[PDB]
Design a protein around this ligand. Structure first.
Ligand SMILES: Nc1ncnc2c1ncn2[C@@H]1O[C@H](COP(=O)(O)OP(=O)(O)O)[C@@H](O)[C@H]1O
Ligand SMILES: Nc1ncnc2c1ncn2[C@@H]1O[C@H](COP(=O)(O)OP(=O)(O)O)[C@@H](O)[C@H]1O
Ligand SMILES: [Mg+2]
Ligand SMILES: [Mg+2]
Ligand SMILES: [Mg+2]
Lengths: 104, 77, 43, 77, 77, 156, 526, 154, 151
């Protein structure tokens, strides 16, 4: 969705929003890598299935592929994801504002 | 190096190259007012570019294939 | 720092050595502090 | 002129020497191209691609680029 | 040393797994010869001449000086 | 027009690159312990104390990182633990990935303030998307609570 | 012959001295280094700095405040020490301006070095700078505008001043929300300058936009065991009594009996005395009891039996803030209940902020004491937000004291420099050159502001100079897109006190440093 | 001023300069007071309370508006001073005590029982001065009748 | 990321490198120091230096010549070495003007530092200086007079 949003934001900020989306893509790749699956193909399959319409699709470590993640009863509260995203964004902005290191 | 915005100028030049079929459009480093590098007479040998690409690719492949380093680590004087 | 022995709580935090009525004490590095006001009173 | 210990840095120095020996020009473009190639290979490796696959893709793309260079070349007297 | 910048040593993967298995095997081999009716006792000298002739595994593992974490895990087990 | 400000000082760029590299290194270090197939890390203190853990906040706190960006990442994981208590590993990975993208974004010639503002816009859009894709829950539904607890305990 | 460069040695081992060239060079290098360090953190597009402590704790601090940067650096250059003390004093006197005064002093000293290179006596430069400072001060005073009579315009000026102060800090992300927060917090002081009455609580986690100014008050203390955890229509009694085995203050007294039964009787008498103390306290008809010192187990058991909340160990600041917010009187004796005023609030309850529990006072009577909850992602973010809020509150309190305001964005510097140039154009001698250098530094300030944003600083400063010479006295830098605009329309306003203090302190320190022609150092202790 | 809720400005202040802490008296000689019964404890508590009340009443009886001490005082005396509309300052240094006595034309009194109206100093204005955003406060005693001591504030 | 400020180290022990700000600062400091040293020996009222050798011979020289002063000093600043070589080559080509050329180079580099401080690309400065040098050379050539015909 953020890739689409960046596509709708022609300008200089479109590149930054697309980079933001690509960075968000990291966690599924890490899950696939840890599960022993092929990361590139698994993430591509996830993206294709999500684009097709189904949004409850995730890594199925038990089966070894991609399926409806609600079938495996893998659910988490929205607060975890919202807080993680918000805190990470604020930390990134605060770090980006820094340009010098002074030793005391 | 010429003081222009890299991404913007490069994207504009690439779009112009795609639009009209002209592979001679490049970066106007000297600010002559034109991007057509053939008119500016910026010419370089074909074999030079081919050798650049070949050497870079072979060195990158050779470096990518090294997965272990065994250094003496003695830090001799 | 001065701590309450019975309750195990930090009464007030303010020094190689110090010495002390358990209200006015002097700390040397003089620095006399009064617990009734929590301020330096003599130097 | 550089005084380096890292073996990859010595490889880059030798790459520049090779470009100087064979062509005599473009000894700086080769290093920049190799650095960019390895920088892209870094993010390709972070996504779980075997470095041999990256090298093979780089070789295929280099072949395509060399053929394109042959296509878009011009002859001078 | 590197980009992580942690004041210490790091071992990852097969290296640390083999280290843990080696420590566990060392602890097992210490007491493996004292099992069953045809087992034999051991002398333990406590650096000041104190002698402990024992066959119990717990006594041997408590009296020993153990440093590796996995070895400590087996001793406390 | 043509040439803009020369930017005679390259030190700010070097500082930004070093900060990003440190954050990316921390994220790469803790990536291995993510998800149900993640593995625990042994951390031995300077005093000899030993801890085995998969919790991201505990891992970040135990190893005394030195680079300032790593310390800010540790504080970020601690804040995530305080506010949520779960996801202390995902947030550090997200921050590291964002700064890794910032590397190429800055290399392309984009001012850091523009990157930060665009990241804020993307954050707002992502919050909207995540809220849209979620579903309500009632505390009287024991099955959902059990599933959430099991999902939390899968990686441990 | 010089003192050091003489055949006979007159110094202890390790003591040296620096004559004309060396003294002036050391002073100028130190001042320029300090100014270059503190700058690039100036203006709306200034960046932050990371301060790594070299101590065992290795404290981490990212900040934009100039005074904070200059305090936590190991400085050995004496002129750099002078500039650091200047910045610290500027921070003490007013909130903002710590970076501006340092940069102005550094630019003045750079101009002084250039003038000295042109064979101009430093005393001539000092006289020229004194005249230039007089002219600039007169111009700045004449350009001041006051809106203290009108409440709506004064509130608009307060909003603009808070926004301008916060524009350079990490709070510029939520500038609007934080400006409203700071303005409300300052206005709740009811005209008092007590900045200690505003308490800032930093809680980790959450977003910066989640920060808020509580409508009542928040206390980080704890309630007793059997005491109620929720009081409606509370009647507060703030006290500063012992309540922990309150011994009779005759320190020469002792219990000297011949049996243990008498000892038991005496301890029962002590417990009865404490119970009578609690009864006298309860005679006031109260629901809540905040004591500055500790409350031991017996008094808290008595309070729980009485069913009244008893908050203990609220330090001097705590009891002062509670008295300000609830209107109570800090009482240490309870023999005249009619002479003691009781604090009042609509509701007392425990709130759950983050993972910590705090006592919340709602519907306070007076409210002349604020608590601000700051939420952030890192401890560094929280510290920087607290510092930025302190700057904003300090500037707002100063503006409340003195309502005269000037226009920021380089407008004040431009008009002062224009006045200095006008004075220099009718002055003979090298004093005119010194005045021109003074005006050059005044120009250099908004030049650095524009440089920090990556704009064409030279062209923008030339445009500002032309506009101010023409008569556009309100022209200034428009930092939204990099043009010039009307600072009155854009609402870029500052406190007149802050700008005047920056100007005067910078000129004074530059004059002080310029007078030195010999630096003599004693042998260090090490 | 010792109490935070004490007024920050006194006009036509009649100052009582004192060198005795507002505390129960204690002999300099090594002394032990024996409590041998409940009646003794009650009498001691009553004596302490009455000493506090008596010293405050003695200070108030002279008509003084301001009280200046050298050795500080404790909570009960502070609250009684606030309750009786007597602004007070504690822990004032010896040289400062002498200068205040010289300027205000008042005598230095070593104990409350010796305090009289004729020993009170006079000051036209006693004020507490703030110094911006610094939290530090200072006290200014000026507008004296025929002050024979001056201070230069830089 | 630069070679020096990278997590991995790419240099020998004792080898280093100075990036944009540091390199420009070192060059400007060295050049300005050389120019300030050689000056004050310029013009009819210039004064002489004392060159006290630190070697075993401990040779003593008193000179007003810029090239002689510049060649007999141990300079580690590479830009100082460039200026010293310039003065030596000027002395080789013609017998006069070593002090003048060194001072002119130092003043030009000081102005270059001032221009760089104002966010001006060094290539722009170089182009402007080339145009200025052309104009000045043409003016000097037009200003010259000749008297070889008249004895
Ligand atoms: N919105 C704005 N537009 C133009 N100039 C601004 C704006 N906000 C702040 N400034 C300028 O930035 C300068 C530096 O302010 P700041 O860095 O916040 O504190 P300090 O005055 O201590 O440096 C001020 O002199 C002010 O004139
Ligand atoms: N009598 C003079 N009047 C005015 N200028 C002079 C006179 N003699 C020499 N000069 C100037 O002094 C300058 C420097 O000459 P000098 O000090 O000998 O060092 P150098 O010739 O090595 O540069 C020359 O450019 C010349 O124009
Ligand atoms: Mg070439
Ligand atoms: Mg989890
Ligand atoms: Mg400010």
């Amino acid at each position: 969705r953020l890739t689409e949003y960046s596509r709708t934001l022609s300008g200089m900020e479109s590149y930054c929003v697309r980079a933001f989306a690509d960075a968000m893509e990291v966690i599924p790749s890490t899950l696939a890598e840890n599960a022993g699956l092929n990361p590139i193909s698994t993430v591509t399959e996830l993206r294709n299935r999500h684009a097709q319409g189904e949004k409850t699709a995730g890594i199925n470590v038990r089966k070894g592929g991609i399926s409806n993640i609600l079938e495996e009863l893998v659910v988490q509260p929205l607060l975890v994801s919202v807080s993680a995203l918000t805190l990470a964004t604020e930390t990134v902005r605060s770090i980006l504002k820094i340009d010098d290191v002074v030793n005391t | 190096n010429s003081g222009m915005n890299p991404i913007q100028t490069m994207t504009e030049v690439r779009a112009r190259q795609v639009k009209e079929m002209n592979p001679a459009l490049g970066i106007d480093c000297l600010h002559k007012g034109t991007n057509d590098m053939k008119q500016q007479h910026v010419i370089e040998t074909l074999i030079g570019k081919k050798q650049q690409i070949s050497l870079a690719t072979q060195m990158v492949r050779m470096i990518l294939k090294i997965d272990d380093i065994r250094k003496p680590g003695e830090s001799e004087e | 720092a001065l701590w309450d022995v019975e309750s195990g709580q930090l009464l007030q935090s303010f020094v190689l050595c110090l010495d002390l009525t358990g209200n006015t004490f002097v700390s040397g590095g003089a620095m006399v502090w009064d617990m009734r006001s929590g301020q330096c009173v003599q130097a | 002129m550089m005084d380096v210990d890292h073996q990859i840095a010595k490889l880059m120095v030798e790459l520049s020497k090779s470009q100087d020996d064979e062509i005599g020009d473009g000894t700086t473009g080769v290093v920049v191209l190799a650095g960019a190639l390895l920088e892209e290979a870094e993010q390709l490796l972070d996504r779980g691609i075997h470095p041999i696959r990256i090298a093979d893709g780089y070789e295929q793309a280099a072949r395509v680029a060399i053929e394109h260079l042959d296509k878009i070349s011009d002859s001078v007297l | 040393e590197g980009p992580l910048s942690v004041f210490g040593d790091r071992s990852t993967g097969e290296t640390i797994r083999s280290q843990n298995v080696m420590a566990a095997a060392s602890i097992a081999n210490i007491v493996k010869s004292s099992l069953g009716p045809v087992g034999l006792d051991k002398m333990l000298v406590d650096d000041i001449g104190d002698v402990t002739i024992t066959n119990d595994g717990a006594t041997i593992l408590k009296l020993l000086e153990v440093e590796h974490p996995a070895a400590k895990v087996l001793c406390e087990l | 027009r043509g040439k803009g400000a020369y930017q005679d000082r390259d030190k700010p760029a070097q500082i930004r690159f070093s900060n990003i590299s440190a954050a990316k290194a921390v994220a790469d270090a803790i990536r291995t312990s993510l998800g149900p197939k993640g593995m625990d890390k042994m951390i031995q203190d300077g005093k000899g104390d030993v801890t085995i853990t998969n919790d991201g906040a505990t891992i970040l706190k135990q190893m005394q990182v030195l680079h300032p960006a790593a310390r800010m990442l540790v504080e970020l994981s601690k804040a995530q633990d305080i506010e949520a208590g779960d996801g202390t590993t995902s947030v550090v990975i997200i921050a590291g990935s964002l700064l890794d993208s910032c590397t190429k974004l800055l290399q392309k010639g984009i001012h850091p303030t523009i990157i930060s503002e665009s990241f804020q816009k993307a954050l707002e859009k992502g919050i909207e998307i995540l809220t849209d894709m979620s579903r309500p829950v009632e505390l009287s539904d024991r099955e959902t609570l059990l599933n959430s607890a099991t999902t939390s305990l899968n990686s441990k | 012959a010089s003192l050091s460069l003489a055949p006979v040695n007159i110094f202890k081992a390790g003591a040296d001295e620096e004559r004309a060239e060396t003294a002036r060079l050391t002073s100028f290098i130190g001042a320029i280094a300090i100014g270059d360090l503190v700058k690039s953190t100036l203006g709306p597009k200034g960046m932050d700095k990371i301060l790594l402590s070299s101590g065992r704790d290795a404290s981490l601090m990212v900040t934009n405040d100039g005074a904070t940067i200059l305090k936590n650096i190991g400085v050995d250059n004496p002129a750099a020490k002078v500039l650091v003390d200047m910045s610290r004093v500027q921070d003490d006197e007013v909130g903002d301006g710590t970076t501006s005064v340092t940069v102005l002093a550094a630019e003045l000293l750079r101009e002084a070095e250039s003038l000295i290179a042109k064979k101009i006596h430093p005393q001539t430069i000092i006289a020229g700078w004194r005249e230039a400072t007089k002219a600039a001060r007169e111009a700045l005073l004449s350009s001041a505008v006051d809106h203290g009579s009108d409440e709506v315009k004064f509130r608009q000026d307060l909003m603009n001043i808070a926004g301008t102060t916060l524009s350079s800090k990490l709070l510029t992300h939520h500038k609007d929300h934080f400006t409203k927060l700071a303005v409300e917090a300052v206005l709740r002081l009811k005209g008092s300058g007590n900045l200690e009455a505003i308490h800032i609580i930093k809680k980790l986690g959450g977003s910066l936009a989640d920060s808020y100014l509580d409508e009542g008050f928040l206390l980080d203390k704890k309630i007793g065991v059997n005491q109620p955890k929720r009081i409606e229509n509370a009647k507060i009694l703030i006290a500063n009594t012992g309540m922990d085995t309150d011994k009779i203050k005759i320190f020469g007294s002792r219990v000297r009996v011949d049996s243990t039964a008498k000892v038991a009787e005496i301890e029962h008498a002590e417990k009865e005395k404490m119970k009578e103390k609690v009864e006298r306290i309860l005679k006031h008809g109260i629901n809540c009891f905040i004591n500055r010192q500790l409350i031991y187990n017996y008094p808290e058991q008595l309070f729980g039996a009485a069913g009244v909340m008893a908050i203990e160990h609220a330090d001097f600041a705590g009891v002062e803030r509670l008295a300000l917010v609830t209107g109570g009187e800090i009482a240490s004796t309870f023999d005249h209940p009619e002479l003691v005023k009781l604090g009042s609030c609509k509701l007392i309850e425990e709130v759950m902020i983050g993972e910590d529990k705090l006592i919340h006072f709602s519907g306070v009577a007076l409210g002349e004491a604020c608590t601000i909850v700051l939420r952030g992602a890192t401890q560094q973010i929280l510290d920087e937000a607290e510092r930025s809020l302190h700057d904003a509150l300090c500037v707002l309190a100063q503006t409340v004291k003195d309502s005269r305001t000037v226009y920021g964005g380089g407008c004040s510097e431009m008009l002062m420099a224009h006045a200095v140039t006008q004075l220099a154009n009718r002055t003979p001698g090298k004093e005119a050159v010194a005045m021109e250098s003074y005006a050059k530094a005044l120009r250099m300030l908004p030049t650095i502001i524009a440089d920090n944003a990556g704009y064409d600083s030279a062209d923008l400063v030339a445009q500002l100079r032309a506009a101010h010479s023409e008569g556009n006295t309100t022209a200034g830098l428009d930092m939204r897109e990099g043009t010039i605009g009307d600072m009155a329309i854009l609402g870029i306003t500052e406190s007149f006190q802050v700008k005047r203090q920056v100007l005067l302190s910078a000129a004074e320190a530059a004059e002080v440093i310029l007078r030195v022609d010999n630096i003599i150092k004693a042998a260090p202790r090490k | 001023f010792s109490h935070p809720q004490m007024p920050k400005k006194v006009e036509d202040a009649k100052i009582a300069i004192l060198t005795c802490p507002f505390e129960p008296p204690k002999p300099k000689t090594k002394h032990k007071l024996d409590v041998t019964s409940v009646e003794d404890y009650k009498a001691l508590q009553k004596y302490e309370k009455e000493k506090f009340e008596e010293m405050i009443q003695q200070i108030k009886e002279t008509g003084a508006n301001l009280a200046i001490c050298q050795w500080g005082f404790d909570d009960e005396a502070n609250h009684l001073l606030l309750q009786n509309n007597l602004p007070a300052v504690r822990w004032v240094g010896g040289p400062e005590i002498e200068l205040i006595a010289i300027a205000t034309g008042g005598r230095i009194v070593p104990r409350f029982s010796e305090l009289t109206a004729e020993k009170l100093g006079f000051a036209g204005l006693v004020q507490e001065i703030s110094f911006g955003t610094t939290k530090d406060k200072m006290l200014v005693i000026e507008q004296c009748k025929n002050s024979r001591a001056v201070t230069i504030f830089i």
